[PDB]
Amino acid sequence: MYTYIQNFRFFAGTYNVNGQSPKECLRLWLSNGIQAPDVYCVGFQELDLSKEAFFFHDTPKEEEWFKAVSEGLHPDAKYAKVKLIRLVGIMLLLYVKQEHAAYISEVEAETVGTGIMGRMGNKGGVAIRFQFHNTSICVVNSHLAAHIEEYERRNQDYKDICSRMQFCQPDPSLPPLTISNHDVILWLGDLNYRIEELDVEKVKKLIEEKDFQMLYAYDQLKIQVAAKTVFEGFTEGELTFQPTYKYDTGSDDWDTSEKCRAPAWCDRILWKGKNITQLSYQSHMALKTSDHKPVSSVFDIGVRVVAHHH
Amino acid sequence: MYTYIQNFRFFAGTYNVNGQSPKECLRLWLSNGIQAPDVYCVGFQELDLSKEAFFFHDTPKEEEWFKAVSEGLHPDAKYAKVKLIRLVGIMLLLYVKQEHAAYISEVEAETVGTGIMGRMGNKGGVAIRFQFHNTSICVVNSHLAAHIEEYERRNQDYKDICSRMQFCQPDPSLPPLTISNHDVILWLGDLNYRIEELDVEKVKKLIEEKDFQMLYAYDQLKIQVAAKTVFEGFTEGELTFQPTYKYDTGSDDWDTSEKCRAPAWCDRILWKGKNITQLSYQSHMALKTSDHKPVSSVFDIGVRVVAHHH
Amino acid sequence: MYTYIQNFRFFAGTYNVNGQSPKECLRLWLSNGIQAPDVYCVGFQELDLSKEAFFFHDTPKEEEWFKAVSEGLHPDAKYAKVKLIRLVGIMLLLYVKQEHAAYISEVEAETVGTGIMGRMGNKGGVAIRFQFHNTSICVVNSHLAAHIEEYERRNQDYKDICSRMQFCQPDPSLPPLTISNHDVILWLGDLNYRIEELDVEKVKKLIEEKDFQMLYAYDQLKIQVAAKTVFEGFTEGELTFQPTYKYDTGSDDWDTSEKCRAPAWCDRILWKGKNITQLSYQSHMALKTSDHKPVSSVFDIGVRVVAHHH
Numbered sequence A, B, C: 001m002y003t004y005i006q007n008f009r010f011f012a013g014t015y016n017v018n019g020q021s022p023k024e025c026l027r028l029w030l031s032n033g034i035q036a037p038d039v040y041c042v043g044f045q046e047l048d049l050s051k052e053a054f055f056f057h058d059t060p061k062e063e064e065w066f067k068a069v070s071e072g073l074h075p076d077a078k079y080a081k082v083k084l085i086r087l088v089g090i091m092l093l094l095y096v097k098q099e100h101a102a103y104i105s106e107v108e109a110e111t112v113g114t115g116i117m118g119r120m121g122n123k124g125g126v127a128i129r130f131q132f133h134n135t136s137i138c139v140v141n142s143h144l145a146a147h148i149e150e151y152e153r154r155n156q157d158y159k160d161i162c163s164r165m166q167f168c169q170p171d172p173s174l175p176p177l178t179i180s181n182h183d184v185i186l187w188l189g190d191l192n193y194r195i196e197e198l199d200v201e202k203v204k205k206l207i208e209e210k211d212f213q214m215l216y217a218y219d220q221l222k223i224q225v226a227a228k229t230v231f232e233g234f235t236e237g238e239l240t241f242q243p244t245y246k247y248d249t250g251s252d253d254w255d256t257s258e259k260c261r262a263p264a265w266c267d268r269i270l271w272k273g274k275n276i277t278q279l280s281y282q283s284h285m286a287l288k289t290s291d292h293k294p295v296s297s298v299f300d301i302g303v304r305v306v307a308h309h310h
Ligand SMILES: CCCCCCCC(=O)OC[C@H](COP(=O)(O)O[C@@H]1[C@@H](O)[C@@H](O)[C@@H](OP(=O)(O)O)[C@@H](OP(=O)(O)O)[C@H]1O)OC(=O)CCCCCCC
Pocket: A049, A050, A051, A054, A115, A116, A117, A120, A122, A123, A146, A147, A259, B116, B117, B119, B120
């Protein structure tokens, strides 16, 4: 046989929904004046903050948010649901255009809890891997540890997801599939990295001034990546939108509670692999259900397709 | 339109069943020579003491006790089940005569755990609110902290149920419904308040002498209400029955175990609202399944009914 | 009526499966060149090591292992499933030849958790009791505390299972059925008792030399039974097979990890009652799914049968 590169459009989204049910149309996030994606990868954090969900019970929030996402996908294409995976509040959805569904194979989904006692699901990661035509793809959604001072724990959460996440494989003989053994890796989530050094007022001033380049110089994810403690070999696109945390629910105002939290680029998307081009990377201010704003990126990704023989 | 007051009969019952399945006919509690209630409000504590129930799993005890209650309702009327709500061992049931069912609306049920780590369901409250004709009603069933020395925690459990219990409402714009925003509030449960100061032998002697007025002078709920720490604006009827805890299972004898627990009026019913009259308040000694006896009260409650226009 | 003793063949098996799904045919354990048993008693430990199973959720491992066992039963007889009981990873299955099913009655199953905080199901026991013809039988499967130094906790786990395990009974009037109130008791499990005194190299040398009599002189279960701290009145057959823990998964090699665990006869079967004869007691090295090997015993057991009147 013979293969060739054919480009497909992948949408990746991440949204921390603060334990809320969906109240708004999600088109403003998932299909806001874009061309129809070929593949949708849609991730949530904090789907359900209840004690019942924490102890691994089913939750109506799973179906509520799945339906909201399905209804918010681009109207020009029929999308097939390929896979849903959830650990407590961390949920990842994979859809493809119906016409591409026949070329999806080897779908596997797994989860890793890195929260209470290092194991519970209040924080951690979920992942879906699959083959699209002849290209292997893994999408990871992680919610890493909270608070500015806990960057070392965020680094450890990342390392633990990478080492513990193992996928099934057709051949029991080879070692299990890990996240890294894929042609294309998309990593999204509330990575929860904050702004070092600067005080809250200075952070807010830089944002008002739209000096995102200066603010980004103090971003913990940037610093840790530069120190090679996390996300080795991954790329992140330039941040041209304002921090996505923390807002008063129902508004675009920064947290006016007593805690008065410093804004942060909590919500991020990164990638690794050949033939990837990021076409956009943005937040969606119009959605106010949560104290975070959703983030999205659209990629053109080259996929190995088998040429038809005649 | 025009409204007028029409009286309906409400039965309220509370029973701590010590993790047991039902073994006796519940008519002796629920329909023991009384007129048929229009509305039944039936609450349990300790429905299931298992670790599985504690971690929020379904339990066969829910259906066993629901059926026992349904079978024990007054035989002269067909009762419609309006709502069931359970948190671990705390369950509340609401029924109305079939003929009144069409005038029930806006039924909402919620729970608040105030047990382990302040959040688990070994203690706490559940509630059902609804509109009957044009009158709003909230029924609360609480199981508050154990032991004579923990009255401050019982006070805190009450305050926490009051502040955390929020109900849905037709209009997202107004603040959520709380327990206090109702025309009629009925609060029942194992409130777990004990007798201060007196030693066990003195308590038992007063009960033998049927001097309930003297024993009540040392009741913690009375004292805390007088200090305005709990149940502000609520009324409780005079206690004319002997303490309902703690008995040897299968008997009317006081706890003969090594612990030799002091008797207490653990199990109580209180109310708040206009046009309420208590017609009775009693315990039911004949039921011996548990180490508590069940308590009941019947009220005449004035309800706002729309007058028919012709 | 008149009764007489008739002998039936009972198979008992215990297998700690290290949280794995079944990968091998279980005939090598359950029907490896033996006559068809009349009754199968098949016990597992560590069916599922997940946090979800630990908090008492259903697991697909239950059905996977039940089907594997059913498929591995002796092919000459149709076996009826009488009962399945599971607590977290501890599962016991009871089957009988179809032709004997009509003579099984009073089947009851219960569990006792003796793990975290003395109550959780990471360790403990499950049991099935029943009447076969006119003889009462109780089969217990226990997973007792780990590690050489914790023999006192293993003793306590045993005592706690014995005192807490209570079965339902036709007559509410008599005291509940306990394990000890049965004509025949079969106790199996990962009892987790280790070899005292000897160092790892010496243990391995004795095993190489096949000097099981000398190694057994240092076995903790033997010592504790002799001290009358556990298993009073029970018998165990001579151990003529090598220790069943701890192996590298997929091999017959001893644990080559850093921990380098000493081999132990973790997995045991004991009995108590009249008219019992052990016909075999062995391990099954050929099964390599787990870090333990399965153990089996076949008994001839005299059962009281009602003579037919003509
Ligand atoms: C081994 C099993 C037994 C263990 C039982 C222990 C139960 C328990 O303590 O969980 C605690 C867990 C903690 O949240 P965690 O994931 O750090 O995530 C939150 C962060 O995302 C931030 O947003 C912080 O809030 P903000 O930045 O202030 O907005 C932070 O709040 P705080 O600063 O207050 O830490 C925290 O709540 O909360 C939950 O997951 C909620 C549901 C479980 C609770 C029920 C059980 C009691």
